[PDB]
Every structure is written in structure tokens, then in C-alpha cells.
Amino acid sequence: VGDKLVFLEALERRVYQATRVAYPLIGNIDITFIMPMGVFQANSMDRY
Amino acid sequence: SDRIAGLFNIPAGIIPTGNVLSTIEVCAHRCIFD
């Protein structure tokens, strides 16, 4: 990779299989959405 | 029922004829078994 020499490992077959443990690389992310509801366009030329 | 579980003693180790070669989580497929 790049110019260096690195490994390429995925452990979920030798370890973490057939046991009741979760592979710690499957993570959760949290994103919040917002939505303006009921807003009305005020005094302008904005409802064309 | 399960008369078959009682024909021959379940854990009675005679000799492994083969090796199941899988090593998976068998709690899932509980139903393909008598």
C-alpha cells in the first residue's frame, strides 16, 4: 500500500467464529436529521 | 416422543467414524435433527 509494506488481515474465520462474540469491526454510527415543518414564506417574491 | 433418543445411549462414544469438518454455531439449525 502506498509505498509501505503492510499486512492485510481479517480474523473472523480463525477466531470469532462458532463463538457467541461479535466481531468488533462492525460498528454503529449516529446521524441526526432535521426538517422544517409548517414554515410559511414571509413577505417577499419567494412564492413564485 | 423421541424414542430414538434412548435406542442407543446418546453420548456413548464408540469411535468417530468421520469428522464434521464444519465448526459452526449449531444452536441455529436446531430443526434439521430428530
Min CA distance, A36 vs chain B (Å)? 46
- Residue A36 sits at the vertex; the CA angle it makes with A33 and A42, to the nearest 5 degrees, is 155
Solved with: cryo-EM
Residue of A nearest to B24 (CA): A18
Instruction: Go through A5-44 and write b for each residue having 16 or more CB atoms within 10 A of its CB, e for each that does not.
Output: eeeeeeeeeeeeeeeeeeeeeeeeeeeeeeeeeeeeeeee
Distance between CA B17 and CA A47 in Å, rounded?
A: 81
Q: Give me the resolution in angstroms, 1 decimal.
A: 4.4
Half-sphere exposure of A34 (CA within 13 A, CB side): 1
CA A15/CA A40 separation, integer angstroms: 58
Q: Is the dihedral of CA B14, B15, B19, B24 positive or negative?
A: positive
